[PDB]
């Protein structure tokens, strides 16, 4: 998938996690987010099209997806423990990472 | 698995590699360690729970696991060539990476 | 596979990409390169055999493969969209990453 | 997935189909829509929650998804023949089926 | 399986759902029912053996199973959300569909 | 596959069923017919190209494939019971459905 | 799955074996009995709910199911040898093993 | 895998079951114990290395592990029934079987 | 498969193990013996064809094969530990178990 | 499948290749032909039923399928490169091999 | 497997086919022979060890196995049609091919 | 793959086999050669583009790949026996076949 739709997947599923009332819906939504974040790591955003592949901005862009992937995996562990409110709280914390990347590069 | 048990897997299997005679036992122990390290990369240790996900400490934490994961993979290559003594020597070298992370974050 | 043969896979398939006239062969070549680069990330090059695994040199070496893996995945996305000339141009741009590592560490 | 998110999948992927320039992305989008429509056939919409399951309203609701599923499969056949503009035109014609159900039951 | 035994599976597992405490047992019982209903859709009951395949009775027969299959799927969705009481209530509603078909064709 | 070749598959295999003298050849031929009928359900015949997707003719066209798929499944059950003459008789009865659709729409 | 329903599977499939007129229904019924018996082997019967898990009663219960499993497989063997009537006689013989455990723990 | 490490897996996972607060960690721990016990069943203990493989000692050792396997599965059954505290009590009960074999062969 | 030929597989592979000069042929031969013994366990020997399936004779026959299976696995264990000569000695030891059952039922 | 139906598969799919306007359908048709020709290599034609299996006639018959299989694989390579007209021309050249065998042995 | 044991498999299973009553036993025996013949095709017999790989003897050797492999496949077709006597007659015909090769190269 | 790259695969891997010091590297390299040789059998070399598909040159070309595939399979058997020097010697002998085809057709 392209970067735009990977963002649709992250956003759409993150909103279902907030609305959910059970661990299974949360785990399923987080699984879809994990695959979108894994795919997105390799993209180049439009604001960075002219930078070199080794620029600090592109290293910083990749670091943001590393952070996001790790936090999604940690939320998945909580959902697998049937700790639904804890997983939802971890999914909310994820938005700090979404926000930080958007501020600089979206 | 949670971080504690990933550390059980790392520590337990590293001891077997040191005492192993044949490459089949080193190979399976390394394979178990590889999976534990790939899982632990995504964790947040207790002492860093309140740091930001992009903090230099959490970045350094994840660097530790990249170094560990790469070193286990290199040791696994030697084990698949049936180079037991070389694989055990690569395993022994890993400990510097274990110790360095513990000193800072355990 | 060992580092040397991963470089064989990269070199051989990149030559085929330059000469291709259809998206299918570009895709197949890029997929092989992706797997070769994934594997090579964990290697330690000769010129670096006596540096520490956490050294700035080994960290930079892994950075080069991250950049390479990302660019290959982006080229693969172009090829899967049947944009043969554009994937070829992305493949040609890989050489800046190949040369930069080689100058430092080959 | 629930009815609401199946509609998300339909809406999101249909927008990507309109904007696509290659058969590959059209195919991938249609496949996701096919799975969403398959799943939604078994749902009961809000406006129909108090009708009998054998009611002419619920029978008509399922008829709409049968028609939708068939049209998506036909569009997918066009996309698999690499007829991008023709699959896009078949996708655009889906909207008559979307609107007709929505007018009655959304 | 023949139609008789599909009916065994439907009747037996519906009784378990009514008495079940946990969602795992409701989920597996519904899964068994779903497979039995999907199989029974293709059958011809004894009393309709000499009707034409397009007869209004055989069409009505297959409509009964479409209604049943959809209702089981909706109940299975609730069970996968761990909503035991709601799933059991959806299961209980199924019986109208069982009874309506039996009255006409058993 | 397209509608024409799905018809080749139905016709070719139905003739082998008549010639067969064992259950295995019959079951294999019926399995191929089932997949062709499943695929064909989504097509639009040339005589109906101008009708709307919800027209009664297109509903009637889909009903014919429903009937055919159900009868193929029933024949498959007999072949699986090693009831070869019974399965062949059921395959002959299938031609009433082929005929009825051809009369109106071929 | 729950012990009571595994018993249902054993009882019902024995009825079908007794009525069957072909090897493949007998084989399919014996296969389902075999799965049900292997799942039942891990259950605790209501009347042994307070014995300890290493009690002679729980070891004897599990042994009882292990012997049933061996006899089911031996009957399945005969059916694969195409000895339908011998397989049916063997299945009928199971009832002595069923009753033996029932006298003790049902 | 080597007998000593299978023992490690049994011991460590028992510690995690005792501390667990949710069914799924208990289930995951019991599943790993089950695999470790089935692999240990094929080992020869150091103190029986010179007995013959059909000796009463080796048959009793293998029987001992077969009984542990049955008790592990029975505990896993309870956990799948969502009886977390009962599954934990059952796991605690295993220690009598562990100690029984240890007295003889450890 | 038929009991007599499973015996062929046991006998022939024992001859190959005795002649082998490498672990992997020994492992491959022991694996085939293990499969043959597990398939033979479900057979009825000609001389027990009229005993009842719960007779002591049929339980003892099945028990006999269960013990052979355990000893084959224990030999396979040694071979995976790269103890080729010990695995060959263990395989040679099987003949006492072969002869024991033969005296009774061959 | 028998020889006759393999020839059906060859004939039917070769007609579709001639009429195709996209690489996808050519590829699918060639793949079916490949499997048909693979299967037919082992057949004995009627006109040769009384020759010896090592006869120059049967050897020549197999040579014809080797030549046919090779040409189909070469056509498939062209189709996988999206060279539709070139694969069609390779398919048309197959007919020299079809006719040459038919003249001798059909 | 080495050539000797492939010959064990051929000879052993051919004897079972001659004495078999049902098609299931002929079918599995033929399947075993087919795999043994496909493997033996690649071997070099002792008496030809010093001939060139393109020698007329090694070519004739491989022709023998092509004839054998084709004949086994034809016999397997008859067995899959449940034509036991015809399959056994095709198997018996194979022996000319066995004998012809042995006379020259055993 | 095309014939040129299949030759790269044969050549590249054959050189690694000579350098190897363990059976695993040799077996892995031989596995890649086997797949390349299987693919190459269907090609037409440039020097033979004008010959007919049944010409003696094209039969001779296919014979060369037959010989190569058989010898690769024999080398694989030795590598699987952990006979590393023997497998390497067999891989060297393979070059006679490479040479003979190149002399005539490259
Ligand atoms: C960088 C490391 C990012 C992270 C982490 C996340 N997003 Fe993002 N997002 C990023 C960019 C560069 C862009 C612009 C993409 C473009 O091609 O223009 C976006 C865009 C979005 C959007 C808008 C998509 C659209 O409809 O055009 C959304 C809704 C979005 N992003 C959501 C989102 C969420 C929820 C994230 C965390 C879970 C997240 N993004 C992370 C870069 C990055
Ligand atoms: C950071 C990058 C680490 C690396 C690399 C390794 N370990 Fe570790 N370990 C780390 C932390 C933060 C912790 C604390 C976990 C907690 O929740 O408190 C640990 C813990 C351990 C333990 C103790 C586990 C326990 O029972 O509490 C052990 C035995 C252990 N670690 C071993 C170990 C080994 C052998 C490593 C390299 C092979 C290794 N660790 C790497 C952080 C990190
Ligand atoms: C570091 C991040 C590298 C990147 C990116 C690429 N290569 Fe590389 N390459 C690297 C090293 C350290 C070495 C030396 C390995 C050794 O054993 O000394 C190489 C070597 C090569 C070779 C020579 C292989 C041989 O036969 O000896 C080639 C042909 C090669 N590299 C090609 C290549 C290409 C095409 C790359 C980009 C697509 C590329 N390399 C990236 C380190 C790194
Ligand atoms: C009946 C046969 C329908 C067909 C065909 C399509 N849709 Fe639908 N849609 C339907 C209902 C009953 C509803 C209401 C669901 C509810 O929970 O109230 C909807 C809703 C939507 C939405 C809104 C989703 C949301 O976020 O609330 C969208 C965006 C939507 N539908 C899009 C859509 C498209 C693109 C369709 C064709 C491709 C389509 N729908 C078909 C019923 C039916
Ligand atoms: C038509 C659309 C049906 C639906 C929906 C259900 N059943 Fe049914 N059932 C149907 C027929 C035509 C028959 C007769 C079968 C025969 O060959 O005579 C049955 C039979 C049963 C039985 C009796 C089975 C037996 O042992 O003979 C039972 C117990 C049964 N059906 C239960 C059942 C349940 C619980 C259903 C809904 C969940 C249900 N049936 C639906 C036709 C149809
Ligand atoms: C509608 C519900 C149909 C059913 C059921 C069957 N067929 Fe059909 N068939 C149908 C159409 C609309 C057409 C014309 C297709 C076109 O694109 O022109 C056909 C065509 C055939 C053909 C001719 C194919 C050709 O070579 O052009 C055959 C041989 C055929 N159909 C056979 C057939 C059989 C054997 C069926 C029952 C098993 C059957 N069809 C069902 C519509 C429908
Ligand atoms: C012990 C080793 C048993 C063997 C062998 C068989 N059964 Fe059983 N059965 C057993 C128990 C402990 C129970 C009680 C289950 C409970 O939850 O109370 C049963 C019960 C049954 C039932 C009744 C189920 C119900 O609806 O209440 C039936 C119909 C039954 N068992 C049948 C059955 C058959 C046919 C068996 C052999 C083929 C058989 N059982 C074996 C214990 C054991
Ligand atoms: C026989 C049937 C056994 C059962 C049941 C259990 N164990 Fe065991 N254990 C057994 C032996 C022969 C040995 C000696 C292994 C050796 O290589 O010397 C052991 C050893 C242990 C150990 C110590 C391992 C070590 O590090 O030296 C532990 C911690 C252990 N066993 C635990 C254990 C548990 C928790 C069990 C039940 C859950 C259990 N064992 C069962 C033989 C047998
Ligand atoms: C009982 C538990 C047995 C064990 C353990 C082994 N064998 Fe057996 N064997 C058994 C029976 C009942 C029979 C008679 C089979 C028949 O159909 O008549 C046999 C037979 C053999 C044969 C002869 C087969 C033949 O061609 O007639 C052989 C060569 C043989 N058995 C070998 C064998 C070996 C090597 C075993 C251990 C490794 C072994 N058997 C175990 C019963 C049992
Ligand atoms: C020998 C090497 C053959 C090659 C290459 C092809 N065919 Fe063939 N074909 C062959 C024989 C011996 C027969 C007779 C089979 C019989 O049972 O008598 C045939 C038959 C056909 C048929 C008629 C099938 C029927 O319905 O009776 C057709 C339509 C046919 N062959 C087509 C065909 C095509 C298109 C081929 C190349 C692509 C082809 N054959 C190759 C022997 C051989
Ligand atoms: C050449 C093309 C052969 C064909 C066809 C068959 N066999 Fe063979 N066989 C062949 C050789 C070169 C050898 C000698 C193997 C050695 O290393 O010495 C054999 C050997 C046998 C044996 C003896 C095996 C042993 O225990 O030493 C048997 C029992 C045997 N062959 C049987 C056999 C059968 C039944 C065949 C057709 C179905 C058959 N062989 C074909 C060469 C060839
Ligand atoms: C015919 C039966 C061949 C066999 C066996 C082998 N090769 Fe080959 N090779 C062959 C041809 C016709 C060609 C020319 C291909 C072309 O399209 O021009 C080749 C070419 C090579 C090359 C050069 C590839 C290149 O870079 O252009 C190499 C390195 C090569 N062949 C190696 C090789 C090896 C190592 C073989 C045995 C293991 C081998 N070939 C077999 C024809 C045939
Ligand atoms: Fe960094
Ligand atoms: Fe739960
Ligand atoms: Fe209708
Ligand atoms: Fe049969
Ligand atoms: Fe016992
Ligand atoms: Fe394409
Ligand atoms: Fe030849
Ligand atoms: Fe080894
Ligand atoms: Zn993507
Ligand atoms: Zn999107
Ligand atoms: Zn984990
Ligand atoms: Zn642990
Ligand atoms: Zn590697
Ligand atoms: Zn290489
Ligand atoms: Zn859903
Ligand atoms: Zn959604
Ligand atoms: Zn059925
Ligand atoms: Zn039943
Ligand atoms: Zn289709
Ligand atoms: Zn066709
Ligand atoms: Zn039940
Ligand atoms: Zn351990
Ligand atoms: Zn045999
Ligand atoms: Zn066939
Ligand atoms: Zn046909
Ligand atoms: Zn072999
Ligand atoms: Zn042998
Ligand atoms: Zn190829
Ligand atoms: Zn190449």
Among candidates I69, I54, I64, which has minimal Cα distance to I106?
I64
- What is d(CA A56, CA A67) in angstroms, rounded to the nearest whole number? 16
Total Cβ atoms within 10 A of residue L56: 10
Distance, in angstroms, between J27 CA and closest chain C CA?
Answer: 13
Torsional class of H71: left (φ above 0), alpha (ψ -120 to 50), beta (otherwise): alpha
Residues 6+ apart with CB under 8 A from I23: I79, I80, I82, I84, I87, L82
Measured torsion, CA atoms of residues H17, H18, H23, H26, in degrees rounded to the nearest 10: 10
| Minimal-distance CA residue to ligand 12 atom 41 | L98
C53, with CB counted inside 10 A (0-12, 13-18, 19+), is buried
Give the chain L residue whose CA is nearest to the CA of I21: L81
Known binding residues of E for heme b are 7, 102
Q: Which chains, if any, share at least 3 CB pairs under 8 A with chain F?
A: D, E, G, J, K
- Ligand 2 neighbour B4 (Cβ under 6 A): yes
Q: What is the DSSP letter of J48?
A: G
Distance, in angstroms, between C41 CA and closest chain B CA?
Answer: 7
- What is d(CA I61, CA I48) in angstroms, rounded to the nearest whole number? 9
Residues 6+ apart with CB under 8 A from K57: K48, K51, K104, K105
Residues 6+ apart with CB under 8 A from B79: B23, B26, B27, B30, B87
Q: What is the DSSP letter of L49?
A: T
Q: Helix, strand, coil % (nearest 5) of chain F?
A: 80, 0, 20
- What is d(CA A68, CA A64) in angstroms, rounded to the nearest whole number? 6
- What is d(CA H41, CA H64) in angstroms, rounded to the nearest whole number? 8
Chains B and L: 3 or more CB pairs within 8 Å of each other: yes
| Minimal-distance CA residue to ligand 1 atom 36 | A98
The beta-carbon neighbor of C12 closest among L2, L8, L16 is: L8
Q: Is K52 helix (H, G, I), strand (E, B) or coil?
A: coil
- What is d(CA A11, CA I77) in angstroms, rounded to the nearest whole number? 51
* Buried-exposed string K8-34: b where 16+ CB fall within 10 A, e elsewhere: bbbebbbebbeebeebbbbbbbbebbb
- What is d(CA F66, CA F52) in angstroms, rounded to the nearest whole number? 20
- What is d(CA A92, CA F57) in angstroms, rounded to the nearest whole number? 52
Q: Helix, strand, coil % (nearest 5) of chain L?
A: 80, 0, 20
| CA separation, residue F82 to residues C15, F31, F32, G14 (Å) | 58, 15, 18, 20
Mutate to test the interface with L, among K38, K42, K63 (most CBs of L within 10 A): K42
- What is d(CA B12, CA J27) in angstroms, rounded to the nearest whole number? 53
HSE-CB of K81 using CA atoms within 13 angstroms:
16
- What is d(CA E101, CA E97) in angstroms, rounded to the nearest whole number? 6
The three state secondary structure string of G51-98 is CCCCCHHHHHHHHHHHHHHHHHHHHHHHHHCCCHHHHHHHHHHHHHHH
CB of F95 closer than 8 Å to CB of F34 = no
**Radius of gyration (Cα) for chain E, nearest Å?**
14
- Ligand 5 neighbour E10 (Cβ under 6 A): yes
* For ligand 2, mutation pick of B14, B56, B106 (most atoms within 8 Å of CB): B106
Distance, in angstroms, between D41 CA and closest chain E CA?
Answer: 7
Q: Which residue has the tokens 């249609």?
A: D30
**Radius of gyration (Cα) for chain D, nearest Å?**
14
- What is d(CA I37, CA I24) in angstroms, rounded to the nearest whole number? 20
Q: What is the DSSP letter of C47?
A: G
Distance, in angstroms, between G15 CA and closest chain K CA?
Answer: 26
| Number of helical H runs and strand E runs in chain E | 4, 0
Find chain G residues with C-beta within 8 A of E28's C-beta. 1
Element (H or E) spanning H34, and its range? helix H23-40
Q: Which residue has the tokens 């505990």?
A: H75
CB of J39 closer than 8 Å to CB of J1 = yes
Find chain K residues with C-beta within 8 A of F21's C-beta. 81
The beta-carbon neighbor of E74 closest among D43, D59, D62 is: D43
- What is d(CA A44, CA A66) in angstroms, rounded to the nearest whole number? 15
Find chain J residues with C-beta within 8 A of L59's C-beta. 63
Cα C1 to middle of ligand 25, angstroms = 3
> Ligand 7, closest atom to CA G11?
35
Find chain D residues with C-beta within 8 A of J80's C-beta. none
Q: Which chains, if any, share at least 3 CB pairs under 8 A with chain H?
A: A, B, E, G, I
CB of G11 closer than 8 Å to CB of G5 = no
- What is d(CA K1, CA K9) in angstroms, rounded to the nearest whole number? 10
Cross-chain residue pair J24–D82, CB shorter than 8 Å: yes
Q: Is D20 helix (H, G, I), strand (E, B) or coil?
A: coil
Distance, in angstroms, between E71 CA and closest chain F CA?
Answer: 20
Please give the backbone phi and psi of residue D19, each rounded to the nearest 5 degrees, phi first. -95, 0
- Ligand 4 neighbour D100 (Cβ under 6 A): no
Cα I50 to middle of ligand 38, angstroms = 41
Distance, in angstroms, between J4 CA and closest chain L CA?
Answer: 24
Find chain A residues with C-beta within 8 A of E81's C-beta. 21-22, 24-25
Q: Which chains, if any, share at least 3 CB pairs under 8 A with chain C?
A: A, B, D, J, L
* For ligand 8, mutation pick of H39, H98, H104 (most atoms within 8 Å of CB): H98
Size (chain I), residues? 106
- Ligand 7 neighbour G11 (Cβ under 6 A): yes
Residues 6+ apart with CB under 8 A from I1: I36, I39, K25, K28
Q: Which residue has the tokens 């005679």?
A: B21
Cross-chain residue pair H70–G52, CB shorter than 8 Å: no
CB of E45 closer than 8 Å to CB of E61 = yes
Q: How was this structure determined?
A: X-ray
- Angle (deg, nearest 10), helices H3-19 and H84-105: 150
Q: Is B53 helix (H, G, I), strand (E, B) or coil?
A: coil
What is the interface size between D and J, counted as CB pairs within 8 Å?
A: 9
CB of D12 closer than 8 Å to CB of A12 = yes
Residues 6+ apart with CB under 8 A from C48: C55, C57, C58, C61, C105
CB of I9 closer than 8 Å to CB of I32 = yes
Cross-chain residue pair E67–D44, CB shorter than 8 Å: no
K63, two tokens = 């022709």
| CA separation, residue A53 to residues C1, D74, F31 (Å) | 26, 42, 53
Total Cβ atoms within 10 A of residue L81: 19
Q: Which residue has the tokens 């040409």?
A: J71
- Resolution reading in Å: 1.9
Mutate to test the interface with E, among F67, F71, F81, F90 (most CBs of E within 10 A): F67
Measured torsion, CA atoms of residues H81, H83, H84, H90, in degrees rounded to the nearest 10: -100
Known binding residues of L for heme b are 7, 102
Among candidates A106, A20, A34, A14, which has minimal Cα distance to A74?
A34
Vertex C39 angle, CA C35 and C42, to 5°: 155
Cross-chain residue pair I8–K12, CB shorter than 8 Å: yes
Find chain I residues with C-beta within 8 A of L80's C-beta. 24
* For ligand 5, mutation pick of E98, E100, E104 (most atoms within 8 Å of CB): E98
| Minimal-distance CA residue to ligand 5 atom 30 | E7
- Sign of the alpha-carbon dihedral angle for I67, I72, I73, I74: positive
- What is d(CA A49, CA A3) in angstroms, rounded to the nearest whole number? 13
- What is d(CA I62, CA I60) in angstroms, rounded to the nearest whole number? 5
- Sign of the alpha-carbon dihedral angle for K92, K97, K100, K101: negative
* Buried-exposed string E12-31: b where 16+ CB fall within 10 A, e elsewhere: bbbebbeebeebbbbbbbbe
Known binding residues of H for heme b are 7, 102
Residues 6+ apart with CB under 8 A from D81: J21, J22, J24, J25
> Ligand 11, closest atom to CA K47?
12
Chains L and D: 3 or more CB pairs within 8 Å of each other: no
- Ligand 6 neighbour F63 (Cβ under 6 A): no
Which residue ranges have their beta carbon within 6 Å of ligand 1? A 3-4, 7-8, 10-11, 14, 45-46, 61, 64-65, 68, 94, 97-98, 101-102, 105-106
- What is d(CA H33, CA K63) in angstroms, rounded to the nearest whole number? 54
Q: Is A44 helix (H, G, I), strand (E, B) or coil?
A: coil
Cross-chain residue pair B41–A70, CB shorter than 8 Å: yes
Residues 6+ apart with CB under 8 A from H79: H23, H26, H27, H30, H87
HSE-CB of D84 using CA atoms within 13 angstroms:
14
J18, two tokens = 């001639």
HSE-CB of I80 using CA atoms within 13 angstroms:
20
Find chain J residues with C-beta within 8 A of F8's C-beta. 12
Give the chain G residue whose CA is nearest to the CA of F84: G22
- What is d(CA I99, CA E47) in angstroms, rounded to the nearest whole number? 61
Vertex L87 angle, CA L81 and L92, to 5°: 170
C31, two tokens = 């997929």
Please give the backbone phi and psi of residue L18, each rounded to the nearest 5 degrees, phi first. -60, -40
CB of C34 closer than 8 Å to CB of C72 = yes
Please give the backbone phi and psi of residue K2, each rounded to the nearest 5 degrees, phi first. -80, 170
Using a CB–CB cut-off of 8 Å, the residues of E that contact F are: 2, 41-44, 52-54, 58-59, 62
- What is d(CA E14, CA E29) in angstroms, rounded to the nearest whole number? 7
Chains H and J: 3 or more CB pairs within 8 Å of each other: no
């Amino acid at each position: 998938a392209d970067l735009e739709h990977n963002m649709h997947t992250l956003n759409d599923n993150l909103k279902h996690i907030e609305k959910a009332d059970n661990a299974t819906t949360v785990k399923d939504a987080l699984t879809k987010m994990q695959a979108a974040a894994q795919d997105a790591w390799s993209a180049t955003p439009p604001k960075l099209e002219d930078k070199s592949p080794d620029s600090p901005e592109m290293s910083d862009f990749r670091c943001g997806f590393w952070e996001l992937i790790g936090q999604i995996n940690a939320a998945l562990h909580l959902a697998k423990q049937c700790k639904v409110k804890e997983a939802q709280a971890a999914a909310e914390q994820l938005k700090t990472t979404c926000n930080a990347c958007h501020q600089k590069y979206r």
